[PDB]
């Protein structure tokens, strides 16, 4: 996997762009579109030939003091139209119609900053938010219900910075400033039932409020992978990729080498390290890697505008093949990357509000 830099631009606000996401629910034949979030806005662009990045429209929050950190795409499960969720310092999740940029509805709960949003891989209505208040929450955006809060003293003890669902959306791994990675299974009887009841809730037809699950005990926890804030995590099948601000993505799994992930118990005290991908100059926290749709590759930018891309299409994780992408004018910290669904474009976004387009 090789790329060349075809364009770049800078947004007018000059504040960090903390998040970038292509819409992988784009319709066939339509051009590729991505969203950026930073300052108090989200902006959409369309990718065209000759490197063109065509500016469409933004949503700008009414509060000049909001600062959006994260966004995620889904679609309306009745109409198929794409939807974009965004959130950040105010702790309010907004669901935006990306065509008109109207905010269709919003959700409050965390009241406290939201550091990441992820939609479930099989159900477009299930949205996970992770917060500076130390909890994760799972919302159903079809019935507008809070399904569950994942927290308690056995939960995270400091800001949660990232989380990821596994392939089938059976379990979440979360991580944050307490240096720990925690697993929360959502295919328990209690959680599958809470999900089904969330779909059954319509406040116009009943008197009761919808009761959320309080999940106070993760199904596995470790602090033995990193020694500082853990700011991005992703499943790779039954293994985990996670990073801190220590210039390494560690590939690891709960338990011993031969332990099946669905047999791990909450008291498991071991982990197995399958590999580690080192890189340079990424000492600051809130720096996220992304993978392509197929999980064949992983990209991470660092604090001086260098991109690293690992090819994971190899027999074992430690055999990953790295290439790097540099441009003499890109020298600000890269906060997040995103691949188009077809893998032909990689976009990096930066602390000086610039956006960089690399074409395969």
């Amino acid at each position: 996997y090789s790329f060349k830099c075809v364009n770049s631009l800078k947004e007018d606000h000059n504040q960090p762009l903390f998040g970038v996401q292509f819409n992988w629910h784009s319709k066939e034949g339509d051009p590729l579109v991505f969203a950026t979030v930073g300052s108090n806005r989200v902006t959409l662009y369309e990718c065209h030939s000759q490197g063109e990045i065509r500016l469409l429209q933004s949503y700008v929050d009414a509060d000049a003091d909001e600062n959006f950190y994260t966004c995620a795409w889904t679609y309306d499960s009745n109409t198929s139209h794409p939807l974009l969720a965004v959130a950040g310092s105010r702790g309010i999740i907004r669901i935006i119609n990306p065509i008109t940029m109207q905010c269709i509805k919003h959700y409050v709960g965390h009241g406290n900053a939201i550091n990441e949003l992820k939609f479930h891989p099989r159900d477009p209505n299930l949205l996970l938010s992770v917060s500076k208040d130390h909890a994760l929450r799972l919302w159903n955006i079809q019935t507008d219900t809070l399904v569950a809060i994942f927290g308690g003293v056995e939960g995270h003890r400091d800001e949660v910075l990232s989380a990821d669902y596994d392939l089938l959306g059976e379990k979440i791994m979360s991580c944050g400033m307490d240096h720990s990675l925690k697993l929360w299974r959502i295919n328990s009887k209690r959680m599958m039932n809470a999900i089904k009841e969330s779909y059954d809730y319509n406040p116009n037809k009943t008197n009761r409020p919808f009761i959320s699950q309080k999940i106070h005990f993760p199904d596995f926890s470790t602090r033995d992978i990193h020694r500082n804030y853990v700011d991005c995590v992703r499943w790779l099948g039954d293994l985990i990729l996670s990073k801190s601000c220590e210039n390494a993505i560690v590939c690891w799994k709960p338990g011993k080498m031969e332990d099946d992930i669905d047999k791990i118990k909450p008291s498991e005290s071991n982990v197995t390290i399958l590999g580690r991908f080192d890189y340079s100059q990424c000492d600051i926290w809130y720096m996220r890697f992304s993978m392509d749709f197929w999980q064949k590759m992983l990209a991470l930018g660092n604090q001086v505008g260098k991109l690293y891309v690992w090819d994971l299409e190899v027999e074992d994780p430690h055999k990953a093949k790295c290439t790097t992408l540099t441009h003499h004018k890109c020298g600000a910290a890269i906060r997040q990357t995103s691949f188009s669904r077809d893998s032909s474009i990689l976009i990096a976004v930066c602390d000086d509000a610039s956006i960089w387009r690399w074409d395969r």
């Binding site: 960090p16 500082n228 804030y229 601000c245 000492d283 600051i284 926290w285 809130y286 604090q303 910290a333 602390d351």
Partner: peptide
């Protein structure tokens, strides 16, 4: 203690 930004 880790910083979010280079400053």
């Amino acid at each position: 203690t880790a910083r979010k930004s280079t400053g």
